């Protein structure tokens, strides 16, 4: 349980098709979790961050996105927004610790980035913790969108665009959401000493 692949990685998925790695049944160490430079946010919505090093948990999951700067506050358990309601929703009874990265020189090319996408259109809300891989065309009207876009049709995936000199906001924040769900079958450690 190194927590060294969700962090310090050259590959980071988009908001849709977000990565998810199980950290099952190994030796956890949260003392090394802190020193990856001052994070933009290290909000711990469940357990206390100071007590998290030595408390008893169960199987954890470490998500991985890239997220625009002004919409990193939509990762709180009940929020409304494109990131919060259409791509990655969190349950209201959360027990995790969302951590940002504030990356601006590693996930933003000079000419821009178009492999970083997010879904804008959906016909319904999202159940929390749901992967949302999809390609097929949205229909906003009384006309089927069979296989071609067109008025009253949009491709429900928009490129982000990450150019330098965009400010504190509008810059790609890598976001890891370490969920700490308990399934009453403990496998990870419960306090290294």
């Amino acid at each position, epitope marked *: 349980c190194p927590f060294d692949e969700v962090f310090n990685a050259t590959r980071f998925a988009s908001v849709y098709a977000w990565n998810r790695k199980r950290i099952s049944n190994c030796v956890a160490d949260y003392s090394v979790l802190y020193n990856f430079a001052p994070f933009f946010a290290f909000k711990c919505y469940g357990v206390s961050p100071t007590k998290l090093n030595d408390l008893c948990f169960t199987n954890v999951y470490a998500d991985s996105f890239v997220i625009r700067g002004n919409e990193v506050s939509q990762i709180a358990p009940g929020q409304t927004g494109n990131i919060a309601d259409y791509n990655y929703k969190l349950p209201d009874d959360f027990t995790g610790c969302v951590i940002a990265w504030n990356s601006n020189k590693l996930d933003s090319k000079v000419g821009g980035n178009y492999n970083y996408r997010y879904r804008l259109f959906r016909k319904s809300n999202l159940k929390p913790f749901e992967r949302d891989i999809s390609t097929e065309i949205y229909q*906003a009207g009384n006309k089927p969108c069979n296989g071609v876009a067109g008025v009253n049709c949009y491709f429900p995936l*928009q490129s982000y665009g990450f150019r330098p000199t965009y400010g504190v906001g509008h810059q790609p924040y890598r976001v890891v959401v370490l969920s700490f769900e308990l399934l009453h079958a403990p496998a990870t450690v419960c306090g290294p000493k």
Partner: antibody
Amino acid sequence: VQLVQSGGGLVQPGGSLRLSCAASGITVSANYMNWVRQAPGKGLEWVSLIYAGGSTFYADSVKGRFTISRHNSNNTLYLQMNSLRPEDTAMYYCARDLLEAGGMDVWGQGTAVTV
Amino acid sequence: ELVLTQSPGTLSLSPGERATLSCRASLSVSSNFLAWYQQKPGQAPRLLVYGASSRATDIPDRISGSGSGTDFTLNISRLEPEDFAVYYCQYSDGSSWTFGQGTRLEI
């Protein structure tokens, strides 16, 4: 494609006026609809917005004293006023403002508040 | 959380002449979320551009949508007597959706 609206009038201050926006060729049950206000002699600003899902948004000046509902049987749009103040005398448009477009705006009614 | 200043507030264009209108955000915002659109006096506003780099339907594509960084400029090549109307630019982030103040256009 084609959206009409009606339901304005003159309302005493603190009374509620029910506002409507019908549609034709556009399903309001899954789209990005929002309202805009033209106070006379002034520019536009937000009123409210409803997502395709059941998530709403409000301007911080007009936060509260508001609601937005979309009927499922008829493809119309509704907002219901509450505890009206006399700086809301304006013209209201229902809109289909996508985030990658501007959509089709509406003729709009004139809501006025006077004693 | 932003203001969208349009300069100048009035512009005295002569018929059949080029027009340049620019609205500048308070921050270095992205281009993929701002749109300019018309407003005729007393009528419904009509879409003009989206994303400040394209056109819209039922438009002769004679309006140039450009703008990089902070100064987002609308360039109008040809103009007609039916096209004298005020112009609003709207920014829509998804968390901040501030609007702009229109510029009156007349001969």
